[PDB]
Design a protein around this ligand. Structure first.
Ligand SMILES: O=C(O)CCC(=O)c1ccc(F)cc1
Lengths: 300, 237
């Protein structure tokens, strides 16, 4: 297990770590989070008590370096930093661990929730969507726009998700207009899977990353991207069978984890009714259909 | 966006535009089979593509062979319409290409948009006007060319005859829409009004009779009376 220490907590803040969250009071003696399960990406996220504007956070992998959080009073946020002095770093954490100034990542042993939400998410792929090459971790916030959103405005601060547009020349072969618009299999399998993503694992990783950015930061363009990537699969008559089975599992855990009180805003009625009841794959998402019907029957 | 009554004068400005109506593309007769089921038989159709400023009607005749062996014909019909309009715009030189194409039914929007991806500068728009272009087939010469077709064919007409020599496009469109509404509301009565009098004839290349200006006023009043008369018959007014 690895550790994200904090220099301090000078401002009152709700801290997120993956799907967990806890409150820290202004100048409470907090020095971070320990026992973080190795083998997964993680996300540490922040919502200030005195200004819920700008949820923000960092995607990181403890295998890639020693990272800590320090408040910057000038820019007004908790910043992630990398410490290269490894023995310095261990020395600091051990003192914080000895004084019990760190919360423990509260992972139940039965519980695979985080694995199931991040199965295909890799740090190297995150760092290509979020471009800041000097850091091994990636900053995302509530307000960052996506490349596609910026085509319809500081490119350095943008989410470079793969653009999906059903009425674009990329999606529609000259001479196959009706075919390709009503059956997106060409766009899914040739343009996206074989051409851009190379395999379904990269596709699902971007889909899972988009969902998590929507859920944890309220990032609107991330929510658009997650729905577009679901719709493109569901709107395809020809999808490898293992892809459909895995999608059902991926979506089931996303719907299971979504806060019930955020459903009115995180779920697009049109996309979901189309995918579950009218689409080519309307019968291929049994687990997702069952949780959506039992948990959010109003949306449908 | 949509075209309506506030921006009605825009139809007659100098931006080339085309109305497209697909309501007579896929046409069928419904009949009983020997086993007592119901069966359809397609008959020839047409796309009604009209530039409102000039009166130019690009009548693409849809021959029944295009439906042979095809499924979901009502859906295919929209995409076939969009294919043909796209082919028409490609056939014209850049200076005769529309800036806007207005579809009379919103179901034509996605088909036409997808077929016209190569033409990002041509706006594809619905309209809130209820245009009676379905009654094109009540015009005898147009009906005749469509039903006689033995193969796909593009037949060209001025839907205003030579009215633009004496009236504005705005007025010519108003006249056309009143005539077509009347033909749509009571076809037999409308044709009676138009052809009651034998000494007013239809010139060899024209669709409508050669009414003088004063006779057109009389005809227009009779057409209005017909619409009002049918509206009263309908609603018991
Ligand atoms: O403007 C006129 O009066 C003559 C030309 C004309 O009526 C026309 C109609 C259809 C077409 F495709 C091309 C020309």
């Amino acid at each position: 297990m690895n550790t994200v220490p904090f220099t301090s907590a000078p401002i009152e803040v709700t801290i997120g770590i993956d799907q967990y969250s806890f409150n820290v009071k202004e100048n409470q003696p907090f020095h971070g989070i320990k026992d973080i399960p190795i083998g997964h990406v993680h996300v540490i996220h922040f919502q200030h008590a005195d200004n819920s504007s700008m949820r923000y956070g960092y995607w990181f992998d403890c295998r890639m370096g020693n990272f800590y959080i320090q408040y910057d009073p000038k820019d007004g946020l908790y910043k992630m930093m990398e410490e290269r002095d490894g023995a310095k770093f261990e020395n600091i954490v051990h003192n914080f661990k000895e004084r019990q100034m760190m919360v423990s990542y509260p992972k139940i042993d039965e519980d695979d929730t985080w694995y199931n939400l991040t199965e295909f998410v890799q740090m190297d792929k995150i760092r290509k969507i979020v471009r800041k090459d000097e850091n091994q971790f990636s900053y995302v916030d509530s307000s960052m726009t996506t490349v596609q959103e910026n085509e319809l405005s500081d490119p350095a601060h943008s989410l470079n998700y793969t653009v999906i547009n059903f009425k674009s020349r990329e999606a529609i072969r000259p001479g196959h207009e009706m075919e390709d618009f009503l059956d997106k299999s060409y766009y899914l399998n040739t343009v996206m899977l074989q051409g851009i993503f190379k395999n379904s694992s990269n596709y699902f990783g971007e889909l899972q990353f988009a969902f998590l950015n929507a859920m944890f930061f309220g990032n609107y363009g991330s929510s658009l991207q997650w729905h577009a990537m679901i719709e493109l699969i569901c709107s395809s008559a020809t999808v490898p069978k293992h892809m459909l089975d895995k999608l059902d599992e991926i979506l089931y855990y996303q719907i299971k984890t979504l806060p019930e009180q955020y459903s009115d805003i995180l779920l697009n009625e049109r996309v979901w009714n189309i995918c579950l009841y009218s689409s080519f794959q309307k019968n291929s998402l049994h687990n997702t259909e069952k949780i959506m019907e039992n948990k959010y029957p109003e949306l449908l | 966006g949509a075209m309506n009554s506030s921006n009605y004068a825009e139809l007659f400005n100098n931006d080339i535009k085309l109305f497209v109506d697909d309501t007579n593309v896929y046409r069928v007769t419904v009949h009983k089979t020997f086993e007592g089921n119901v069966a359809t038989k397609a008959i020839n159709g047409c796309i009604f593509t009209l530039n409102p400023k000039t009166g130019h009607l690009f009548l693409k005749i849809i021959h029944t062979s295009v439906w042979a062996g095809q499924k979901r014909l009502s859906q295919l019909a929209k995409w076939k319409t969009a294919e043909e309009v796209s082919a028409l715009v490609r056939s014209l030189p850049k200076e005769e290409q529309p800036k806007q194409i207005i579809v009379t039914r919103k179901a034509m929007l996605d088909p036409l948009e997808v077929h016209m991806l190569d033409f990002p500068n041509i706006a594809i728009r619905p309209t809130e006007l209820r245009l009676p272009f379905s009654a094109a087939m009540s015009i005898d010469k147009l009906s005749d060319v469509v039903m006689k077709a033995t193969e796909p064919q593009m037949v060209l007409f001025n839907i205003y005859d030579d009215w633009l020599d004496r009236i504005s496009s705005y007025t010519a469109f108003s006249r056309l829409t009143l005539l077509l509404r009347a033909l749509k509301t009571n076809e037999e009565s409308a044709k009676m009004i138009l052809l009651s009098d034998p000494t007013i004839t239809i010139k060899s290349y024209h669709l409508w009779p050669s009414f003088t200006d004063e006779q057109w006023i009389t005809i227009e009043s009779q057409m209005r009376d017909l619409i009002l008369t049918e509206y009263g018959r309908k609603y018991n007014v």
